[PDB]
Each structure stands twice: as structure tokens, then as C-alpha cells.
Amino acid sequence: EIKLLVCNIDGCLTNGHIYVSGDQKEIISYDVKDAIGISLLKKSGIEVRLISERACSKQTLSALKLDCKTEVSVSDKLATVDEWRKEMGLCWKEVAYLGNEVSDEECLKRVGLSAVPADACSGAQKAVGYICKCSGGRGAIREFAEHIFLLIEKVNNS
Amino acid sequence: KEIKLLVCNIDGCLTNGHIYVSGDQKEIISYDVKDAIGISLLKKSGIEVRLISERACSKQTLSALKLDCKTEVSVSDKLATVDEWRKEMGLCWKEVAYLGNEVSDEECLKRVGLSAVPADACSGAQKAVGYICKCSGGRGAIREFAEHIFLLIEKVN
Amino acid sequence: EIKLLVCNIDGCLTNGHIYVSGDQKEIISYDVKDAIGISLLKKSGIEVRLISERACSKQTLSALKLDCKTEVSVSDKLATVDEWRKEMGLCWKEVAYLGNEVSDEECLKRVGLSAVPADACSGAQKAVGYICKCSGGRGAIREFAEHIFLLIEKVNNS
Amino acid sequence: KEIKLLVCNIDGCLTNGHIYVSGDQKEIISYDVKDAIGISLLKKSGIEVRLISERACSKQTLSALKLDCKTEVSVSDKLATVDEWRKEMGLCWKEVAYLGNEVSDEECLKRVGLSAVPADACSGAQKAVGYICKCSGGRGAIREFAEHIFLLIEKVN
């Protein structure tokens, strides 16, 4: 199984670039490739949720049109992800996590399937068993999704 | 044989594939002036340029690029559409170039006289072509391919 | 002398990236380095003017806060630059031009001092005698400005 | 000697140096989350981080980065200011790191115990330092330097 994929926003969903104004309006972006990859995980029954340590601009979030439950301003990502885990009656082996930062490490080492984008910090890279050829905001979510579908194939054809 | 039609996939080829959001969010997309001019230069040399996508694309957003290119979006079957354009224009497959990136482009990439992908195209598309651009999608790949096409025209003449 | 520098907007002032919305609002950007370089040319008596073949978003232009007379939607850049030349009672040898595109070539080959950014088209590169190490929107204007001040030094210390 | 103060130039180091304009233009600037977290990590390890600029910089725009860093802008004489911060904090020059890019940073770059510039820093600044970052300004250079600093702390301990 994988039943949940949790994705860090800044650096996995996005390339980590922020564009900000004096009135605190922020622009961030995601790639079509990755949106498609989220669409396809959802289609197949895998819930995708977005997570962040940052105080992300309030509804820049919904403007993403990704239909994912999100939680920002997170200090203990293991706690919240474990809260999501308990909510969807889930097991740690069925939780996937794409991470990139030091604050992701607790989650990465704990989950059933861990990955990082090509440009993740050294510490997040050491914590995982799958390092994407693609970088954050540039196909890593799509790349990882296709890795996940390969695991479900293995269980299906077993 | 001389190129007379170029077909470009929209997302990740003409655009850089990104959707830029804020909240006052009419959505923003990004492209490179180099590529718009590449299209301009192809059209002036007598090469028709057309745009395509498997997905919805805002007529209005694309009109903002001022490319004056026949476009078809939400295209279920890209080869069927390009075939119909090819016949429409009285052309051979060898007279058709295709710059594409996604899997849905792969059939076309394999049939056309001249195929390419931008540097950051999916692995399947990269395998389907004779030319992988140095430049990435929405960041010079159309211009690069256009120049490649011009060099071929004078190599044959 | 150099008394006028003309700069193509897309690809010299900017990196040539356009960000556009369905309501045709455009975002473009310039680097602080280059703004400083324009400030410094102006301080020393050299007029800087901006030129474009493109139908640039109407007053994205003034929002640049660069204090340069501009003309967009230009089909014959040699004509207009020659119009500016005649207006400021100028000679072709005192006109400088930073260009990047095929449509810049007439101007580049004609002016007293020609340059292009590192990422200019092959054709614009062949037309000039100074190729910047810096790319468009990324220091080329500043780089070229410092090249111009070196020429005025040569005349001053002559 | 252990670093206890990092000073970063704002334009082209903390930001990518770009001013993004449109027309509804309150102006937009760009930075990298990697770098904000790099600052967060330095502060948590006990290293004070301060920002500086020879030019005006919007208090309000910078507050949007949520860095909680003492900042001085329109600074005529960067060495004089860093010297006053150094003394204020009871520090040696060897305890001070500086990431900078423009010419106005060069004096400081030469005095401090640990100097750096981002990849795209002016030629004069690059010459003034012991470390030129792979990453460019506003795109990971502060994080890169921060990690470099951490590696030094454990190399000495």
C-alpha cells in the first residue's frame, strides 16, 4: 500500500522561489507535470496533502487549484503527519513523503516510502532511499508519483 | 525535404510549464521573447506554425502572446489532428516539424520529418526524437529548434 | 564621445522572460546592477533610451522608474534611433547601442559603439565588436556602461 | 575562531537583485526559502545575522521575509557600520562572516574572519573573498555559505 503522500510546499511542490510585495502578496508557482502527477495519485485512491513550516500567504494556497488539504506554519511535521495518519486510519508504511529540508527529516525516516528532489539539502538526502533526478517544482512530484505506481504494480501483480 | 509546418506543444514547450499563482489570481504563465521571435522568423520565411495541447488552454491568455498561430486545445489525439493539418496544407510528413515534450506528443514526434524536445522534456519524449534542445521549455527551445531548421534549409539548398 | 546609449528592452534590459495573465497584465524585471549602470551614464551626461519591436504592456514601462524616454512597437529600429540621433543633434559615432536580436543588426553595425549580451542571437553577436560576459537582464547594461566610461577616459586623458 | 555574526548585503545576495514590475506595481522582489531557512539555522545555532545595503530598502517589503534580522539601509560606509555591530556584540573581526557582492562590500569582505560572495557577484567582490558560492544571489548562496560555516565550526571543535 501507499494511501497518503505528504508533500512539503517550498522546495518540493515549488522550486522554493518566493516573489513578494510590500503589501505581503506572494507569487509562487507549480509545474503542470507535477499537478498532473497529483491528479493521477488522487484518481487512483491515494490522498495527497500539502505541508509547510512557513507562514504561507493565506490563499495563494487555494489559488493552486490542486484540491489538497493543507497545513502551513508547522513546527513539528512529524506530529501533524502522524495526526493525518491517525485520521485516515493509516499505517506508517502506507504513508509516503516527499521532503527537502532539515525539518522534513523526522518524517522522511519514519514513513513507508521517502523521497527528495535533486536539490534537497544534504540532510534530507541522507534520510531517504529515493533521490529524484528532478528538482523541486520541476517534476519531482511527478517523478515520485511514477515511482509509487511502480510499488502498487508490484503488489498488484504479486 | 523542406519544412513547411511546425507544431509546438503548449505547456512545457511554448510556456515554461509553470502556473504562477497569488490570490488576485487570474493565473500567470511565462514564455521567452526569443521563442516568440523564433515563431515570427519561421512565419516570415514561409513556415506555418501551429500550437497544440492535450489540455484546456485559455484562448485569451494565449492571445496575449501575440503569436497569430492557429491553435487547437483539449486535443484527445494529437497525431489525428496533425495529420488533418498536414493534409489541409497539402504536405508530406517529411515537410512537418514537431517540438514536443509530454508522452501525448510521442506519436507525432516519431512520424514527422523533423522532431525535437526541449532540454527538460519527459524521458519518453527525449527518446522519440533526433534533436534534444540545450534550452528548456518556455526558455529558448522553440528559438533553438527554429535556427536548427534554418540551418537545414540552407544545407539542402 | 558617446552621448546616447540605446538599449533594446527584451533581452538586454530584461532577461527576455515575460510573465503574462489572461487580462494581458505583464510582469518583467530588471536587475539593480543595470539600473545603477543607467543611473551612472545619465549622471555623466549620457542620455539612455529604451527601444522595442514588441507591443510592450502599456505602463509596465513607467513602473520601471528608470527615467528613460522609450519607444515600443518599433518595426524599423534604425529609423527611430536615427530619429533620436537627429533630435539630440548627434553623430553616429556618439551613438551607442546594446542589442540582442536580428532586428537590432541594422543599428548595431551603424552605431559608433556596439555590444550584445552573452546570450544574444548569433546574428547580433557577429554585428558587434563587444560581447558582454553578462547576459541580458543580468548585468550587461552595467558591463557595457563600464566599457563606455573607459572610452571617455581615453578621450579625457588623451 | 568561531563565527558569531553574519552580515549579508541585501540586493543580489539576499534577493536575486531583480525588481519585478507590472503597473499595479507595488514592486516585487524575489528570494529563496533555502536562504531564509539558512538564516533560521544560523540564528538557532547562536549566530546573529544582520542585513545591510548602501541603498534604500523597504522595511515593509523586508518584513515580508519574516527573517527577524537587525537591518541597516542607505548605509554610506559599510565597514563603519559592521565595525560598530562588531564592537556592540563584543566580537573580534575573526568572529565575523560577510556575504557580499557589490563594490561597497569589498572593505568588509577583506576585514572579516570569513568572507564570501554569490556566484553572480561583481568581479571586484569575487577577488576580495576566500569563497565564491556555486549558487547565485537570492537563489541559495546564503544557505550554501551557512552550511560552509557549520562545517568550519565542527572542523574546529
Check residue B90 and give left, alpha or beta (phi > 0: left; psi -120 to 50: alpha): left
Q: Do A31 and B24 touch (CB under 8 A)?
A: no
Question: Cβ(C15)–Cβ(C138) under 8 Å?
Answer: yes
**Assigned C-alpha cell, B114:** 523533423
Chain A residues with at least one Cβ partner in D under 8 Å? 10-11, 16-27, 53-55, 101-103, 121-122
- Which set of grid coordinates corresponds to residue B82? 496533425
Sheet holding D96-99: strands in order across?
D71-72, D48-52, D5-9, D96-99, D114-116
Q: Measured at the alpha carbon of residue A35, what is the angle toward residues A110 and A72, in degrees to the nearest 5?
A: 50
Pairwise CA distance, residues D145 & D148, whole Å: 5
Residue D25 corresponds to which cell in the numbers above? 506595481
Cell (9 digits) for D98: 560577510
Supply angle C-alpha B17, B18, B23, rounded to 5: 150
| Nearest chain B residue to A134, by CA | B120
Q: What is the 3-state composition of chain A as percent helix, strand, coil, each rounded to the nearest 5?
A: 40, 20, 35
* DSSP 8-state symbol, C77: H
| The C-alpha cell that represents C13 in the structure block | 534590459
Contact present, B99 and B6 (Cβ < 8 Å): yes
C83, with CB counted inside 10 A (0-12, 13-18, 19+), is exposed
Cβ partners under 8 Å of residue A7, min gap 6: A13, A48, A49, A50, A51, A68, A97, A98, A141
The residue count of chain C comes to 158
Domain C1-158's class? alpha beta
How does strand B28-32 pair with strand C17-21? antiparallel
Encoded amino acid at B35, one letter: D
Nearest-CB residue to D58 (from A16, A22, A55): A22
CB distance D126 to D100 below 8 Å:
no
Instruction: State whether residue B91 is helix, strand or coil.
Output: coil
| Helix/strand/coil for C15 | coil
All residues of chain B having their beta carbon less than 8 Å from the beta carbon of residue A32 are: 11-12, 17-19, 55
Task: Determine the distance in angstroms separating the CA of A137 from the nearest CA of chain D, rounded to an integer.
Answer: 13
State whether C32 and D24 contact (CB < 8 Å). Answer: no
Residue among D115, D118, D106, D112 nearest D142 (CA): D118
| DSSP secondary structure string for all residues of C60-72 | TTGGG-----EE-
Which CATH superfamily does the domain covering D1-157 fall into? Answer: HAD superfamily/HAD-like (3.40.50.1000)
CA of B6 vs chain A CAs: smallest distance (Å): 23
- CA A56, chain centre distance (Å): 15
Angle, vertex CA B57, rays to CA B122 and CA C55, nearest 5: 105
Of D142, D131, D115, give the one whose Cα is nearest residue D15: D142
Among C22, C27, C54, beta carbon nearest to B33: C54
Query: CB of D128 within 8 A of CB of D110?
Result: yes
C-beta separation of B17 from B138 below 8 A: yes
Alpha helix positions (H), A28-132:
32-43, 77-87, 105-110, 122-127
Nearest to A20 among D28, D34, D37 (CB): D28
Would you state the cell numbers that stand for residue D157, as one nine-digit string?
571543535
Range B83-89, long-range pairs (CB < 8 A, 24+ positions): B85/B5, B85/B7, B85/B50, B86/B5, B89/B4, B89/B5, B89/B48
Put the strands of the sheet holding C70-71 in their side by side order.
Answer: C70-71, C47-51, C4-8, C95-98, C113-116, C130-131
| Cβ contact B33–C24 (<8 Å) | no
The residue assigned the cell 493509516 is A90
B84: Cβ contacts below 8 Å, ≥ 6 apart:
none
Q: Look at residue B128 and give its three-state secondary structure.
A: coil
Element (H, E) at A48: strand A47-51
Residue type at A30 in one-letter notation: Y
For residue C32, the chain D residues in CB contact (below 8 A) are 11-12, 17-19, 55
- Distance from C-alpha of C60 to C-alpha of D21, rounded to nearest angstrom: 6
- Using what technique was this structure determined? X-ray
Q: How far apart are CA D137 and CA D130, in angstroms?
A: 17
Question: C interface mutation test: which of D9, D20, D21, D139 has the most C CBs within 10 A?
Answer: D21
Residue B96 host element (H or E): strand B96-99
Pairing of the two strands A26-31 and B18-21: antiparallel
